[PDB]
Design an enzyme around this catalytic site. Structure first.
Site, short mmCIF file in Angstrom:
data_model
loop_
_atom_site.label_atom_id
_atom_site.label_comp_id
_atom_site.label_asym_id
_atom_site.label_seq_id
_atom_site.Cartn_x
_atom_site.Cartn_y
_atom_site.Cartn_z
N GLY A 1 -9.50 -11.68 47.93
CA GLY A 1 -8.61 -10.66 48.44
C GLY A 1 -7.22 -10.78 47.85
O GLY A 1 -6.61 -9.77 47.56
N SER B 1 -7.73 -8.56 51.96
CA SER B 1 -6.95 -9.49 52.76
C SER B 1 -5.83 -10.09 51.87
O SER B 1 -5.94 -10.12 50.61
CB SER B 1 -7.83 -10.64 53.29
OG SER B 1 -8.28 -11.51 52.27
N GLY C 1 -9.14 -16.00 48.75
CA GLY C 1 -8.93 -16.18 47.32
C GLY C 1 -9.26 -14.93 46.54
O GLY C 1 -8.61 -14.61 45.55
N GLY D 1 -13.29 -8.38 48.45
CA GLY D 1 -13.49 -9.57 49.27
C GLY D 1 -14.01 -9.24 50.65
O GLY D 1 -14.13 -8.06 51.02
N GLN D 2 -14.36 -10.27 51.45
CA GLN D 2 -14.93 -10.06 52.79
C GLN D 2 -14.16 -9.08 53.65
O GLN D 2 -14.77 -8.17 54.17
CB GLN D 2 -15.10 -11.42 53.54
CG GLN D 2 -15.58 -11.24 54.97
CD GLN D 2 -15.75 -12.58 55.66
OE1 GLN D 2 -16.39 -13.50 55.13
NE2 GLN D 2 -15.18 -12.72 56.82
N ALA D 3 -12.83 -9.28 53.85
CA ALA D 3 -12.07 -8.40 54.74
C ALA D 3 -12.08 -6.98 54.25
O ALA D 3 -12.27 -6.08 55.05
CB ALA D 3 -10.65 -8.91 54.92
N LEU E 1 -1.57 11.75 47.64
CA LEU E 1 -0.97 10.42 47.51
C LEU E 1 0.49 10.40 47.14
O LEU E 1 1.21 9.57 47.65
CB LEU E 1 -1.76 9.56 46.52
CG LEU E 1 -3.23 9.35 46.81
CD1 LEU E 1 -3.81 8.29 45.88
CD2 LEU E 1 -3.46 8.92 48.27
N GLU F 1 2.76 12.48 48.01
CA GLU F 1 3.53 12.83 49.20
C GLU F 1 3.75 11.65 50.12
O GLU F 1 4.81 11.58 50.74
CB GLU F 1 2.95 14.02 49.95
CG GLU F 1 4.06 14.80 50.63
CD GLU F 1 3.56 15.81 51.62
OE1 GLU F 1 2.54 16.48 51.31
OE2 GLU F 1 4.14 15.90 52.73
N1 LIG Z 1 -9.31 -7.93 60.17
C1 LIG Z 1 -10.14 -8.67 59.43
N2 LIG Z 1 -9.70 -9.79 58.86
C2 LIG Z 1 -10.66 -10.44 58.18
C3 LIG Z 1 -11.98 -10.08 58.03
N3 LIG Z 1 -12.65 -11.01 57.24
C4 LIG Z 1 -11.73 -11.90 56.94
N4 LIG Z 1 -10.50 -11.61 57.48
C5 LIG Z 1 -9.22 -12.29 57.24
O1 LIG Z 1 -9.06 -12.42 55.83
C6 LIG Z 1 -8.55 -13.74 55.52
C7 LIG Z 1 -9.56 -14.53 54.71
O2 LIG Z 1 -9.85 -13.80 53.51
P1 LIG Z 1 -11.28 -13.20 53.18
O3 LIG Z 1 -11.21 -11.75 52.93
O4 LIG Z 1 -12.29 -13.73 54.14
O5 LIG Z 1 -11.54 -13.95 51.79
P2 LIG Z 1 -12.11 -13.37 50.42
O6 LIG Z 1 -11.31 -12.21 49.95
O7 LIG Z 1 -13.56 -13.08 50.52
O8 LIG Z 1 -11.82 -14.61 49.46
P3 LIG Z 1 -12.66 -15.96 49.16
O9 LIG Z 1 -13.76 -16.04 50.20
O10 LIG Z 1 -11.60 -17.04 49.31
O11 LIG Z 1 -13.19 -15.81 47.76
C8 LIG Z 1 -8.20 -14.39 56.86
O12 LIG Z 1 -6.83 -14.17 57.14
C9 LIG Z 1 -9.18 -13.71 57.82
O13 LIG Z 1 -8.81 -13.72 59.20
C10 LIG Z 1 -12.43 -8.89 58.64
O14 LIG Z 1 -13.57 -8.43 58.61
N5 LIG Z 1 -11.43 -8.23 59.32
MG LIG Z 2 -15.08 -14.57 50.62
#
Ligand SMILES: Nc1nc2c(ncn2[C@@H]2O[C@H](COP(=O)(O)OP(=O)(O)OP(=O)(O)O)[C@@H](O)[C@H]2O)c(=O)[nH]1
Ligand SMILES: [Mg+2]
Ligand SMILES: Nc1nc2c(ncn2[C@@H]2O[C@H](COP(=O)(O)OP(=O)(O)OP(=O)(O)O)[C@@H](O)[C@H]2O)c(=O)[nH]1
Ligand SMILES: COc1ccc(/N=N/c2cc(OC)c(OC)c(OC)c2)cc1O
Ligand SMILES: [Ca+2]
Ligand SMILES: [Mg+2]
Lengths: 426, 436, 155
Positions: B146, B140, B144, B10-12, B252, B254
């Site tokens: 993550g 994250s 959804g 996912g994005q994060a 890992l 450890e």
């Molecule tokens: N630290 C950090 N938090 C992030 C980042 N991108 C998103 N978040 C956090 O991650 C959560 C949102 O989930 P995302 O990872 O964006 O969603 P995803 O996994 O892509 O899931 P969907 O878009 O719902 O399919 C929120 O709590 C955001 O603040 C990032 O680059 N860094």
């Molecule tokens: Mg996303």
């Protein structure tokens, strides 16, 4: 989640629909012939959401235009962006509905529904990843209301996994003194509760009140009302059309704004309010949450916000917006439910609309919208108790129980809003 | 040398993964095209950096990593960025439609369309390993994808790689930079379903990182770029023992032996010091005693909680740079004369120490000043239950009204899964109370 | 049965047919199954010329149907201003109450027929008349936030 298929049905639906296309084409640098004359690269990044790319780099709206009255096609065609619409996308009957919901939904409208669906299929099959649909229509007439709801239901059967969003114009005797309009709106609300994911409630009562009392216009016209409608439609579609630090789409808006499936009727708001041919962040946050700036004639201070999304447009400090938005939630703390944490979302878009440096758009899911539904319900009940004009409906194959069922569903909807307005966290 | 595979979901997970691999390249002397001039053995090797980087016959050093997202926007930035040539193109997997911030969509309906492809691509990387130890999974809690896709992936990895370790780096939600109202739901659902499949998980509280950026780095309104650069610094400090020679946390297994006394209480707290702004290039150099005391201050933690309110079960100190071992011994001795550091009666009150004598690397464009010595403390303290209670309370407020539940049920999930998840969290809260 | 044909002609707005039926003995005060007379139908469907004709030929301006609706209640509900004035000039009871406790004033206030509201007030409509739920026309204006109507009721 990219493309949206837009449908506009009936007179109101086509008039507000044409205005939408004129306003957003100007924002995206699209001229009335379909050419891109803009300067910013941010205008074409998500152009595909509303437009299909065509030969000679020509941008054609993914719009379907429907009406039982053939005269509507001519008014649309005679408009500035009237030639930008695809000629195959105009579906028009011979005789109107005469403000009869039963003609739109069961007889004239039902004959023309397969033809519209053929055009929807052609537009949908040319989408890489269709998000869903947007319909513009009034609830007081016969075509936008009766046929519009039939179209929503048929689209729903063929695309059950896509989002259905409406911009539905609520009737008012201040703009149209036609006594069968509460019947048509009540029968439509019964369909919208079941078959749409999200509905923007655009109330002719509030539109008229804003023109008359705030803009000092003694005799407001449809053009004056539609100016407020187009500014609102531009504002609430901002994040679908511009990149921003969020990748917004219709399903993420629904999941975060709709906590209970039937409570999907939004109260839109806009600041600053201006008349045709005629600001700081704390003032924008203030105006945005004022009853005088709501497009539905409801006082938000009579209910509670379940969820709110705000869009600020223009160049401003993003830290200042966070500070003012935090401030409004502390001083107006009793107007937000305590059991949905972090229920206010903000977005900032760099490009402001036409003629303005600063603008704020509000999308509220508030229990105070029950005031709009009670106003229509009281008028429906006054007519229905005397069975006035009922034969106009039953003569088209409608059972009398359809009226009782619609009335009962609307009163149930009002009770559901009251239940969450009185709910506490403890 | 035993290989590690990193998976970014996912994005994060993807954005943090990009920042981590950029830092790893700078620490090991690897160029954006994969060339490493200090690697005398071309086409292979058994060096410590080979745990994270495979080698081609042409001398290219490729990350043992997979990037997965249900939509393509974020991964497309990796495909066209500075390090575009570093990754295996088949290592970057994208769907067309995301989980719309819905755990059920990521786990049950949209996620199922790509799970087999992701497992087949992970299998291809595993087949290239001589002694795979396990996986590092970045994601994250709130998204959804993550939340839901990670749970589905962790369930499958347990079936196909039974004896391999699985460690997570999880982003815990904060109101200041969150995306969705339903993030508390997603967080509890993914925690429940992944608990039995993860051996160790490092939570990163977005609110903690946001406050450090604001206070220490003078960043008025931190963005994801600022948060991710600080998070990558901390992640590098935690994984350094796997990538370089050392005597602490060298594999890992450890990490589990040193930090996880019982399988369910597998959430260590990370603390990092010093964090100094790049605009203070001429800053006075902090001693071993100063940076070590800084690990016991709540302001420097990766998760907002108060360790004075809890008991310690383990404590590891990982130093980087100009650090004399006798200075660490003296600094620790002074820490033992502080009543606000209590260990459970069933654990030896010791601190484990690892020192890497190379100072940390700064990323060009970053917010951090160069320092001659830094420390990352990893501790298992019962005070982290405060983070779980905060999340559990936000879940309870909505769940009591069944707000938003219909979106999860409509995506092939039973309503009872919410109660089963919450009950598991109530038992996890009691597990911390039983220890102390 | 000319009374049944007179009911149909009054509703359909067939002026000539109304005169012919009356000339041949049709009952101007005939009722349908719910107690509606030719006058109630002409007033509901906005046939001003038929309302005047019936009133000059013995129609009871205050006839009630089974729900207590008078022709004035129906004219005020549907919004036929000119018919409201003709009914009042011929002795219609401005304060007649139906089975729901509604007066013509209540119905004109609900439907937003502000000009009719003004006419009724000028003819002595009672602002303190309560419906079966205790609501006066002023209560309706307050509860629905109709400032325009509330100003008229205060004048
Ligand atoms: N630290 C950090 N938090 C992030 C980042 N991108 C998103 N978040 C956090 O991650 C959560 C949102 O989930 P995302 O990872 O964006 O969603 P995803 O996994 O892509 O899931 P969907 O878009 O719902 O399919 C929120 O709590 C955001 O603040 C990032 O680059 N860094
Ligand atoms: Mg996303
Ligand atoms: N705001 C606004 N309301 C409009 C406009 N046009 C019509 N309305 C309202 O829409 C309602 C009537 O619906 P129409 O759209 O005219 O009817 P239709 O859908 O064409 O249906 P038929 O004519 O019965 O076939 C009334 O409440 C009007 O006040 C417009 O351009 N703007
Ligand atoms: C209460 O919590 C939340 C509510 C709504 C959320 N965002 N929703 C959007 C979606 C949009 O797409 C139409 C927007 O364009 C109009 C949009 O403009 C700001 C926001 C996200 C939430 O965490
Ligand atoms: Ca080598
Ligand atoms: Mg029409």
């Amino acid at each position: 989640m990219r493309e949206i298929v837009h449908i506009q049905a009936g007179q109101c639906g086509n008039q507000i629909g044409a205005k939408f296309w004129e306003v957003i084409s100007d924002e995206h640098g699209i001229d009335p012939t379909g050419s891109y004359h803009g300067d910013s690269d941010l205008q074409l990044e998500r152009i595909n959401v509303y437009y299909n790319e065509a030969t000679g780099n020509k941008y054609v709206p993914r719009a379907i235009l429907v009406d039982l009255e053939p005269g509507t096609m001519d008014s649309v065609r005679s408009g500035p962006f009237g030639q930008i619409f695809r000629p195959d996308n105009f579906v028009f009957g011979q005789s109107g509905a005469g403000n009869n919901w039963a003609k739109g939904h069961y007889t004239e409208g039902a004959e023309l529904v397969d033809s519209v669906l053929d055009v929807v299929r052609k537009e949908s099959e040319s989408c890489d990843c269709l998000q869903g649909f947007q319909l513009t229509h009034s609830l007081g007439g016969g075509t936008g209301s009766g046929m519009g709801t039939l179209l929503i239901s048929k689209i729903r059967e063929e695309y059950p996994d896509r989002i259905m969003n409406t911009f539905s114009v609520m009737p008012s005797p201040k703009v149209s003194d036609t006594v069968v309009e509460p019947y048509n709106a009540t029968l439509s609300v019964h369909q919208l509760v079941e078959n749409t994911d999200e509905t923007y409630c655009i109330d002719n009562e509030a539109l008229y009140d804003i023109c008359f009392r705030t803009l000092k216009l003694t005799t407001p016209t449809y053009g004056d009302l539609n100016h407020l409608v187009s500014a609102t439609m531009s504002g609430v579609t901002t994040c679908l059309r511009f990149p921003g630090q969020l990748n917004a789409d219709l399903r993420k808006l629904a999941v975060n704004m709709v906590p209970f499936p039937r409570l999907h009727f939004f109260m839109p708001g806009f600041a600053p309010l201006t008349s045709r041919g005629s600001l700081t962040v704390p003032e924008l946050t203030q105006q945005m949450f004022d009853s005088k700036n709501m497009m539905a004639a409801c006082d938000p201070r009579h209910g509670r916000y379940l969820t709110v999304a705000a869009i600020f447009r223009g160049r401003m400090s993003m830290k200042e917006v966070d500070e003012q938005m935090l401030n409004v939630q502390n001083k107006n703390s009793s107007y937000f439910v305590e059991w949905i944490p972090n229920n206010v979302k903000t977005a900032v878009c760099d490009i402001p609309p036409r003629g303005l440096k600063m603008s704020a758009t509000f999308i509220g899911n508030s229990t105070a919208i029950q005031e709009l539904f009670k106003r229509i319900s009281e008028q429906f009940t006054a007519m229905f108790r005397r069975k006035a004009f009922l034969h106009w409906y039953t003569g088209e194959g409608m059972d009398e129980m359809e009226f009782t069922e619609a009335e009962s569903n609307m009163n149930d909807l009002v009770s559901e809003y009251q239940q969450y307005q009185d709910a506490t966290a403890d | 040398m035993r290989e590690c595979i990193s998976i970014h979901v996912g994005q994060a997970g993807v954005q943090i993964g990009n920042a981590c691999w950029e830092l790893y390249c700078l620490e090991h002397g690897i160029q954006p095209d994969g060339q490493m001039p200090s690697d005398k053995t071309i086409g292979g090797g058994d060096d410590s950096f080979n745990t994270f980087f495979s080698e081609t016959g042409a001398g290219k050093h490729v990350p043992r990593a997979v990037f997965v997202d249900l939509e393509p926007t974020v991964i497309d930035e990796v495909r066209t960025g500075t390090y575009r040539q570093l990754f295996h193109p088949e290592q970057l997997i994208t769907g067309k439609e995301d989980a719309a911030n819905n755990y059920a969509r990521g786990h049950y309906t949209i996620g199922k369309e790509i799970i087999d492809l992701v497992l087949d691509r992970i299998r291809k990387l595993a087949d290239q390993c001589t002694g795979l130890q396990g996986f590092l999974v970045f994601h994250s809690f709130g998204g959804g994808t993550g939340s839901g896709f990670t749970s589905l992936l962790m369930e499958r990895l347990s079936v196909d790689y039974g004896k391999k370790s699985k460690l997570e780096f999880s982003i815990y939600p904060a109101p200041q930079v969150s995306t969705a109202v339903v993030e508390p739901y997603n967080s509890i659902l993914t925690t429940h379903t992944t608990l039995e499949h993860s051996d160790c998980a490092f939570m990163v509280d977005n609110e903690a990182i946001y406050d450090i950026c604001r206070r220490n780095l003078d960043i008025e309104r931190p963005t994801y770029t600022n948060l991710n650069r600080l998070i990558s610094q901390i992640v590098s400090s935690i994984t350094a023992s796997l990538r370089f020679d050392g005597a602490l946390n060298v594999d890992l297994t450890e990490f589990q032996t040193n930090l996880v006394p019982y399988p369910r209480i597998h959430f260590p707290l990370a603390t990092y010091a010093p964090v100094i702004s790049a605009e203070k290039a001429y800053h006075e150099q902090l001693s071993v005693a100063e940076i070590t005391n800084a690990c016991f201050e709540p302001a420097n933690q990766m998760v907002k909680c108060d360790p004075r309110h809890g008991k310690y079960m383990a404590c590891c100190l990982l130093y980087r740079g100009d650090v004399v071992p006798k200075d660490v011994n003296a600094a620790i001795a002074t820490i033992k004369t502080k009543r606000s550091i209590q260990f459970v009666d069933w654990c030896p009150t010791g601190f484990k120490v690892g020192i890497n004598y190379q100072p940390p690397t700064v990323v060009p464009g970053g917010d951090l000043a160069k320092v001659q010595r830094a420390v990352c403390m990893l501790s298992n303290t019962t005070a982290i239950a405060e983070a779980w209670a905060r999340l559990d309370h936000k879940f309870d407020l909505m769940y009591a009204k069944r707000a938003f539940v219909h979106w999860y049920v409509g995506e092939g999930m039973e309503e009872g899964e919410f109660s089963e998840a919450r009950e598991d969290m109530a038992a996890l809260e009691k597990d911390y109370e039983e220890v102390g | 049965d000319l009374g049944k044909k007179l009911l149909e002609a009054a509703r359909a707005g067939q002026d000539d047919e109304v005169r012919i039926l009356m000339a041949n003995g049709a009952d101007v005060n005939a009722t349908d199954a719910s107690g509606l007379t030719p006058l109630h139908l002409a007033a509901t469907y906005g046939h001003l010329e038929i309302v005047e004709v019936l009133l000059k030929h013995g129609a009871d301006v205050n006839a009630i149907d089974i729900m207590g609706s008078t022709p004035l209640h129906l004219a005020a509900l549907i919004g036929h201003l000119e018919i409201v004035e003709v009914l009042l000039k011929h002795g219609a009871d401005v304060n007649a109450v139906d089975t729901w406790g509604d007066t013509p004033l209540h119905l004109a206030a609900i439907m937003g027929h502000l000009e009719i509201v003004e006419v009724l007030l000028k003819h002595g409509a009672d602002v303190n008349a309560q419906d079966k739920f205790g609501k006066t026309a002023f209560d309706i204006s307050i509860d629905n936030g109709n400032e325009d109507l509330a100003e008229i009721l205060q004048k």
